[PDB]
Structures are given as structure tokens and as C-alpha cells.
Structure 1
Amino acid sequence: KIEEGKLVIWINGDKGYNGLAEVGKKFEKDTGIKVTVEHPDKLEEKFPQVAATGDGPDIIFWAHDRFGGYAQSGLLAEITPDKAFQDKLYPFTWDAVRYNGKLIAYPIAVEALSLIYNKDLLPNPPKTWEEIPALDKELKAKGKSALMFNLQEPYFTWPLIAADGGYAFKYENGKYDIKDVGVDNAGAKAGLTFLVDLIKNKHMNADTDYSIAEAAFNKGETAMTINGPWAWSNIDTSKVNYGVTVLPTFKGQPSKPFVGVLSAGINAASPNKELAKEFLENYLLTDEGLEAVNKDKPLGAVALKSYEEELAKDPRIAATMENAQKGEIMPNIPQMSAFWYAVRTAVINAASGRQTVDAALAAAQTNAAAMATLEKLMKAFESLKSFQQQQQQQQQQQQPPPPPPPPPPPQLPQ
């Protein structure tokens, strides 16, 4: 809970919690305040439960895109680092921890998709998407393919579609304009067109998923793939002489991958907000702190400028940061749920031929507002029923509103 006089930290099991515990000991040595690090199962699901009743950890570690939902439910304390501390980190990461004007977390690490290439098949990676078709028929002559990446998930296909001017929601002040959606502009249109052309000219298969794209690259069957820092360990094992580099340009514009930021938030119910802020600002977000965490489990690229420059000596890490700098910070707003489902269908339908490019993307725009507001209404029936639970004396699994009558007037009058 609160944990008055101490600090309890939740961080996912797959991270460097042992390294974080070691910063905890260093903090315990100069202050006498003991730090407890734990990694419960599905802590991103548990936090919304316990924090709503004033319990839980003092500080939570998760990808920034979950925090928008938390801050909306008032579960995170507004943080106030002064200007001096802010300049210690990359200015773009602060934009990943801002919910409606307010700063609600500290950025730790940075993730983004990169171009991963087989050095032995490709001496040098293309700087340009446009030259991939030419490159594929050069490698096909050797029974090899140029590129294979997951086409089923928008996360992977977005970098291209967004390249010439697409975007999820327009951001211009720490606040996302939810009626300015850019899935239906000329830039996005140009991007998805190129992608569909790649599939229909047989340079790519419409059924390529994560597993198939990973198996092909790790068996040296394909020259290139698009993936993030979590996929590297498997390529090390495959013994593929691989490189990680900046994504290819399209129509002269860099690709725009989604940027996910590991963030540290303070529970709005913690009485140890001061302790937590001193721990994060002066012990963890330091070269010595991140180093200790990194040693246990690599963070990839980090938000702190000083330690990032030390980690950039690895050209894989330097490439993940450079991609992220030219990429699009993933909106933390609830309307993103709609965007995922809409663009998923728009890409799958354009790819298979079921729909055209212009139609698939135009339908997504409508599906964005339609599915997005639906979530607001779904919360209304879910809050009206929830009020009834606490009034009388899984269970909420009800949800009626099934009256959508379609009036079809007979416009005959001849």
C-alpha cells in the first residue's frame, strides 16, 4: 500500500529487477529507508484494482501507453522535476509521460522497430523502400528473399504507412486532438498502396506473421526483417551475422515506427511521494543506477542522455534510438483501442484484395470514431450496472443495450 516510511516498487519480471534492487540497497544505505522490489503476475492488471482502494506499490514500472488509463482514473501523482533535471533526458521522451498537460511519470528506456539485416546476404542495407522490389528479384535469383516481416499486426506495418504523412492522432501541446485522425490522408494512402503493391507483385506473402518472418530470418532464408530489441537474443542463437540499422525511407521521408517508453510512475495514494521522487531523480536516473539495472537485463536505449551516449557504442542500441527519434510516440489515450482494431482490419482487407486502399483507409476513419465512442458508452452501461452492485448488497459480465433498430424508409414515391 501507501507503505509509510519505506518504498515498495513493482516492475515486470522480465526486466532487471535484481539490478533495481541493488539501487534500492544503495538508497537504503544513505537514508535508512528500505526499498522492496517485487514482480507480481499481471501487475498492469492488478495496479488498477489495488490503487483504486489506496493500496498497491509506491512506484510502478510499465510502458507509458498504459499510464494514460491510470492517470485518467487519477491513480498517478503529478511529478515535478525542475528544468535542470528535465534537460538530463531526451526532450521527446517527456512527451510520452504527459497526460493532459500534467507530467505523470519518469521516462526510463526507449523502444522502437529497426531494420535487421543479414550481413552475409546483404553487405549493405537499402536506405530506401522503393529499391526493395529490385533487391528481391536480385536475391530470388539465389533462392533468397529481400524482406520478410509480420504483416498481420499494424504495429509492424505502420512505420511505412505513416512515413509520407500518416498519424494516429494529432499531438500539439501535451494533448491529443481526438478528432484529428490521419489514417485517411494522402501520405497514409501512398504508404499502404506501396505495401499492397509489394504483396501483389509477389515480393511478399499476405500471410506472413511474426513466427514465419522470424523463422525465415533466423534460417538465413531472407536478407532483412523489421523487429525490435526483444528479438535480438533469438538471432544471437541462430548464429546469423546480423546488423541492426535505421529503417528505410519512403518518398524521401523516414519511417515512423511507434515509440514505447518504459516509465516510472508514483502512486497517487503513496505517502512517500517525496522519498519516491528522490529515489528516482537522484539514484535511479543516474549513470550508476541504470548501469546496475542494465547489467541484470538490458534496457535497450535509455532516456538519460549521459548513459545513452555510453550505450550507443553498441550500433544496435544507437539504431533503436535513431529510429525512435524519427518515430511516433504511441498515444496513451483510450481512443487508441479503436485505432488498433480499425487499422488492423484496414490493412488485412487492402492486402487480401477484399477492399481497395482508398476504401479500406476511409472505412478505418469511420471505424475509429464509431468504435472509439462505443467504448465510452460501454463504460456507461458498465458504470450504471456497477452502481447497482454496490447498491443492492466475474459478475458484471452483463451488458444489454441491444436495441439498434434500422429504419429503412421506402423512398418509392414515383
Structure 2
Amino acid sequence: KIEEGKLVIWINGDKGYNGLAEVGKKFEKDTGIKVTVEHPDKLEEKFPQVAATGDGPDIIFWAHDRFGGYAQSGLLAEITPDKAFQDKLYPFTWDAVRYNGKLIAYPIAVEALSLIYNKDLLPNPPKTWEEIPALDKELKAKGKSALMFNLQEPYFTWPLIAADGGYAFKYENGKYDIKDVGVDNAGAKAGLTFLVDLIKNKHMNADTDYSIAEAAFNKGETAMTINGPWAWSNIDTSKVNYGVTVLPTFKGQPSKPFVGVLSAGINAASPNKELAKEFLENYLLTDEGLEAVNKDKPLGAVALKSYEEELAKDPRIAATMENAQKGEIMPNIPQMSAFWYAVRTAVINAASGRQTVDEALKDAQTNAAASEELRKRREAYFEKQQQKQQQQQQQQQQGDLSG
């Protein structure tokens, strides 16, 4: 319980928060209610820490994968859009924000990573990963590199890992299996190996992060990067002649991005739930609301039918979709937090050459399952204690005192 007269909204610093705030100023102008857009760091880690005290914003924006965990900890209010409003959004976007049969967020846009390339350096982009090392060496004769992307976040590395058969959680019998992690298999080991070889062989640098990769591409120093729709604003401004296309194949298989649906959840502790719903339904999720955000930082393939339709002809959104088709929409189950942390640690560890790919992926295999492991052992502990207590009492009733 923190606000009453106003809406505080959290969104990631790489998204169009300036357009979001514009929508806020329009909401204030019509309503009298002040809207404050914030973009703090690590907001997806910060939210569950602050919302569990009665602090935290009224509306949080993130990809849908985190919302399962938030919902499970009781942190999101159930949203109540009517059927008419639901028909305004593509059905599959609604499923991404369904947890235990309840709607826990409003979907905004579908996001997938793509290959972004400088047409002046590289008029034909490579179709496979395997040809990138030779391309990197060729480009050195011009003082350029082939490719730079964010190696610090497993999101950007996942598509190459999943290509030859890496997965998060096997879907089976209408259930995600959470002792069945696919980060340790041969296809995952082949993908990470190839990445680590690129790094060790100096085609890439292990400490390359989001902003270093961005700068290199937007200044014209690298022929390619890998990024989502949000990144296109800055490329336009740099004036680099760029195309957006299919991610390269690995071992003849498509790269498989983990697809995110940018979503808006309402804090369960918020005393402004109705204002938040009003804001989201009638201000943000309209052509004009999404136009404001989208013209700041592109959203991708938007959830709202009428506006997606207005953006239908953009070849960059087409490539986003093609990349989404070859990928999978992320699970939103509570275990996603642990999966990401485990894969982050493993990539960073293998990249720096501290652990082998084998050791690092085996470690992530354990780390991603360790939560359900603890739960199983906790159950067994109390069941065994109950058994011993039962058996000790039945043995103790070998004799009893009587008056």
C-alpha cells in the first residue's frame, strides 16, 4: 500500500519509457491522476523484493516469463478484462499471461531476437554460424569485426544453444516437466562450445555487453549484431544502412530464440488497481497509446490487432515474426528465474575459460533443478519423521500403565 492518488509504473530502460510517460501525461490531463514512469536497474529482481513489503510500483512491465513467479508469490492482482476487450488482442498473447487458469497481466507485444546487419559492409548476411569466423578474419583487412552482441545475458546466447537441441523445460502431457532440464545435452554442448571457441579465438570478447555491442554496430565497427525491436531507434539515428533478418543456422538447424511477450502486471498490494486497469485498457492498449511507445522504442509484433495491422508492412517486424516462428514462446512457470540464473552463470563461466563447457552446463543442469530437489527432500524429511514417531509409539505401546 503506497500511492493512492497516483500511478507509479516500472519498465525496462531499453524500452520506450518516454512514449509511455507521454501516455501518462495524457492520462493525468484527462483524469487529474499523476503517472510516474520509472526505469530502475534490475527491476525484475527488485520487484519481488519491494512488492513483498507494500512498496513497489502499481504497474510493472516485463516479458511474461517472470510473471509466473510473481503470481506464485502472490504479487500480482488478477486482471479482469471483459470478453469484448479480450477480442482486441491475439488469443495466443493471452495464453502467455495465463497462470493457473487466471489472467495475471496485459500483453503488449511479441518480442524476438533477429540478426541485424550493416548492408554497406555485408550486402549478403551469412546464413550459417559456421561461416562467421572466416567472415570475421576477412573483415579484419578493413579494420572491422563480423559480429558483436550481448554475451552477459543468456537471452542473446540461448538461440545458438537451443539450435541443435537445447531446451529449458520439456513440455509433455500438457505440463512443463521441472526435473527435465535440457541444458546438459549434446546439442546444448555443441552450441556453447562453438560460442566459446569464437571467444577464445578472438572473434569475440568475453566482456562484450549490451551497450558495447550497440556502440560497435551503431558506429559501424562491426558488420552484425543480435538484438530485439527496441534497438532499431538507435540504429536509425546512427544512419547505418541496416537490414533485419533470420538468425544464422547452426549445424543446419534454425536458431531458436526464446520469445517474450512484453506484459503489464498490476501490483497486488496497490490501492490503485482500478486506475491501473483504466490506464492500461483505455489509454495504453489503444492505437494512439501504442503509437506513442512504439515511436519511442519499437515494440515488435504488437498484441493489439488494430495497431499490429497498421504496422503490417514493416519488413523488420516480418523478420521478428520469422525468428519468433522458429523459436518458442517462453514458459512463465515459477522455475524460470532459476533457469535463467543457472544459464547466465554457465555462459559467463565457460566464456571466461574458468570452467569447461561440460562442467558449466552440468552445473547449470543441477542449479536449474535444485529447487524441486529441495522440495522433494523436505517432503521426505517430514514423512520419515512422522513414520519414526508413529513406529516409536506403536513399539512403546508394548506396555502401558493402568490403575
Same fold (TM over 0.5): yes
* Identity fraction in percent: 96
Q: 8 Å contact 1:101–1:173 — kept in the other structure?
A: no
Spell out, residue by residue over 1:7-53, the C-alpha distance to the aligned partner (whole angstroms, 9 max, x if none). Answer: 77665687656755776788799999998878789876776577556
Spell out, residue by residue over 1:147-186, the C-alpha distance to the aligned partner (whole angstroms, 9 max, x if none). Answer: 2333343222111001122122234688643212110123
Secondary structure of the equivalent of 1:331? coil
Q: 8 Å contact 2:66–2:334 — kept in the other structure?
A: no
Q: 1:356 to 1:412 in 2, by over 3 A?
A: farther
TM-score (norm 1): 0.71
Spell out, residue by residue over 1:322-373, the C-alpha distance to the aligned partner (whole angstroms, 9 max, x if none). Answer: 3234334444445344333432343344445554444432232123334xxx
Q: State the shift of 1:133 in Å.
A: 3.3
Spell out, residue by residue over 1:197-253, the C-alpha distance to the aligned partner (whole angstroms, 9 max, x if none). Answer: 434555444454445434433343321111234444443444422222221122333
Q: 8 Å contact 2:6–2:35 — kept in the other structure?
A: yes
Number of aligned pairs? 396
Q: State the shift of 1:254 in Å.
A: 2.2
- Following the alignment from structure 1 to structure 2, what is the Cα–Cα distance between the partners of residues 246 and 395? 63
Q: 1:279 to 1:389 in 2, by over 3 A?
A: farther
- Following the alignment from structure 2 to structure 1, what is the Cα–Cα distance between the partners of residues 283 and 385? 43
Q: 1:283 to 1:202 in 2, by over 3 A?
A: closer
Q: 8 Å contact 2:9–2:35 — kept in the other structure?
A: yes
Q: 8 Å contact 2:230–2:297 — kept in the other structure?
A: no
Q: Which moved more, 1:350-359 or 1:124-133?
A: 350-359
Secondary structure of the equivalent of 1:95? helix
Q: 1:118 to 1:47 in 2, by over 3 A?
A: closer
- Following the alignment from structure 1 to structure 2, what is the Cα–Cα distance between the partners of residues 70 and 398? 43
Q: Which moved more, 1:263-272 or 1:237-246?
A: 263-272
Q: 8 Å contact 2:7–2:34 — kept in the other structure?
A: yes
Q: 1:235 to 1:4 in 2, by over 3 A?
A: closer
- Following the alignment from structure 2 to structure 1, what is the Cα–Cα distance between the partners of residues 272 and 392? 37
Secondary structure of the equivalent of 1:129? coil
Structure 2: gaps (5+ residues): 395-399
Q: Which moved more, 1:318-327 or 1:200-209?
A: 200-209
Q: State the shift of 1:76 in Å.
A: 1.9
Structure 1: gaps (5+ residues): 400-410
Q: State the shift of 1:107 in Å.
A: 0.6
- Following the alignment from structure 1 to structure 2, what is the Cα–Cα distance between the partners of residues 29 and 234? 30
TM-score (norm 2): 0.73
Q: 8 Å contact 2:65–2:336 — kept in the other structure?
A: no
Q: 1:89 to 1:228 in 2, by over 3 A?
A: same
Q: 1:220 to 1:393 in 2, by over 3 A?
A: farther
Q: 1:149 to 1:306 in 2, by over 3 A?
A: same
Q: Which moved more, 1:357-366 or 1:87-96?
A: 87-96
- Following the alignment from structure 1 to structure 2, what is the Cα–Cα distance between the partners of residues 27 and 271? 18
Q: 8 Å contact 1:101–1:175 — kept in the other structure?
A: no
Q: 1:393 to 1:221 in 2, by over 3 A?
A: farther
- Following the alignment from structure 1 to structure 2, what is the Cα–Cα distance between the partners of residues 49 and 363? 26
Q: Which moved more, 1:45-54 or 1:236-245?
A: 45-54
Q: 8 Å contact 1:99–1:174 — kept in the other structure?
A: no
Q: Which moved more, 1:96-105 or 1:353-362?
A: 353-362
Q: Which moved more, 1:388-397 or 1:352-361?
A: 388-397
Q: 1:290 to 1:189 in 2, by over 3 A?
A: same
Q: Which moved more, 1:387-396 or 1:31-40?
A: 387-396
Q: 8 Å contact 2:69–2:337 — kept in the other structure?
A: no
Q: 8 Å contact 1:101–1:174 — kept in the other structure?
A: no
Q: 1:275 to 1:345 in 2, by over 3 A?
A: closer
Q: 8 Å contact 1:18–1:296 — kept in the other structure?
A: yes
Q: 8 Å contact 2:113–2:226 — kept in the other structure?
A: yes
Q: 1:271 to 1:232 in 2, by over 3 A?
A: closer
